[PDB]
Design a protein around this ligand. Structure first.
Ligand SMILES: NC(=O)c1ccc[n+]([C@@H]2O[C@H](COP(=O)([O-])OP(=O)(O)OC[C@H]3O[C@@H](n4cnc5c(N)ncnc54)[C@H](OP(=O)(O)O)[C@@H]3O)[C@@H](O)[C@H]2O)c1
Ligand SMILES: Cc1ccc(NC(=O)c2cc3cccc(O)c3oc2=N)cc1
Length: 316
């Protein structure tokens, strides 16, 4: 049920449904599970141009509105501007295309998906002849201006950013003539990577931190090393799970909720979708919180340093 108030005065449900699934998973699944998530109780839905599921996720949302389960106002829908669209003249059409695909009139949240700008083209990841990705140099404040223009048009209720470090946040915040600061920063966050001081910064700036891969990434081989720890097998999460008679995933999600973090949870399994909303049913003790805090190992699951050269690369 619970929402947080955004600095532009809109309200974001603190539990969101992540919709990304690898190209293998048939697109029809995005429709089914998103309806399941809405039936379960999720009211915040996270998607992006990159995910290649906006049509199906939007269709699920329209279906739940049309069968009378919720109203458009109950749903908080996020899309993300992909990095090949950072040039300002590309921002508004990318949003309009996302809206045409999803068949909604606005998104509640439009994010700059990443700070690392890419070469403009109808290619999602443009490669040169050696197969390496071609970067673009774009002053992200101009991107932000085009985002603000989308807000004024009513195409996006709120606007924010994703995968931005402290300096990139402040570069947007110091911007001359800034009309709107980001309501949120959506970054990887979980017990192995808590973002304690990035979160503290954000709290100071009235910017929500939004956790993704908060259950530990889907452990895709293309992006994640198999030798990495599996977050849900962690001894302390498993112990706390058995103590509260919950699951390690529920522990992780509740952990974020009690540090004032809005948390996403991907699941394409009906049981787990309906289990994840139980995060509102129990509390962790202050000592449980301390013990989960103790797991912080500054661990990225997404191996990104193949892009270390990028001037806007966030882990510089
Ligand atoms: N801004 C960004 O750059 C960025 C990057 C990555 C992701 N995201 C967003 O964040 C969302 C979630 O992050 P994510 O895709 O990395 O996955 P995640 O939320 O970390 O979930 C990881 C895996 O945990 C499993 N799981 C879910 N609920 C469970 C439960 N109750 N018990 C045990 N296992 C459970 C799921 O598998 P099953 O499907 O089998 O349940 C899922 O594949 C994405 O879907 C996407 O919308 C954003
Ligand atoms: C130069 C450059 C620009 C952008 C990126 N980023 C990614 O590859 C992403 C992968 C991804 C994967 C799953 C879900 C997401 O939400 C994702 O979001 C991403 N931004 C990397 C390098």
């Amino acid at each position: 049920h619970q929402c947080v108030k955004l600095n532009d005065g809109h309200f974001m449900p603190v539990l969101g449904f992540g919709t990304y699934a690898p190209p293998e998973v048939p697109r029809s699944k995005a429709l089914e599970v998103t309806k399941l998530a809405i039936e379960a109780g999720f009211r915040h839905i996270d998607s992006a141009h990159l995910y290649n599921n906006e049509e199906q996720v939007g269709l699920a949302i329209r279906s739940k509105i049309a069968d009378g389960s919720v109203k458009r106002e109950d749903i908080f829908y996020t899309s993300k501007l992909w990095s090949t669209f950072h040039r300002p003249e590309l921002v508004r059409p990318a949003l309009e295309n996302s809206l045409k695909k999803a068949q909604l009139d606005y998104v509640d949240l439009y994010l700059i998906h990443s700070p690392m700008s890419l070469k403009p083209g109808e290619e999602l990841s443009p490669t040169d002849e050696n197969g390496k990705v071609i970067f673009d140099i774009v002053d992200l404040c101009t991107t932000w201006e085009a985002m603000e223009k989308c807000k004024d048009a009513g195409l996006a209720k709120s606007i924010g950013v994703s995968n931005f470090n402290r300096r990139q946040l402040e570069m947007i915040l110091n911007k001359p003539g800034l009309k709107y600061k980001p309501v949120c920063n959506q970054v990887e966050c979980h017990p192995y990577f808590n973002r304690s001081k990035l979160l503290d910064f954000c709290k100071s700036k009235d910017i929500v931190l939004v956790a993704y891969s908060a259950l530990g990434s889907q452990r895709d081989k293309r992006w994640v090393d198999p030798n990495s720890p599996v977050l849900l097998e962690d001894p302390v999460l498993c112990a706390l799970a058995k103590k509260h008679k919950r699951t390690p995933a529920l522990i992780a999600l509740r952990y974020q909720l009690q540090r004032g973090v809005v948390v996403l949870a991907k699941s394409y399994n009906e049981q787990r979708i309906r289990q994840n909303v139980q995060v509102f049913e129990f509390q962790l003790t202050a000592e449980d919180m301390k013990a989960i805090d103790g797991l912080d190992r500054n661990l990225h699951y997404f191996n990104s340093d193949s892009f270390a050269s990028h001037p806007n690369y966030p882990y510089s």
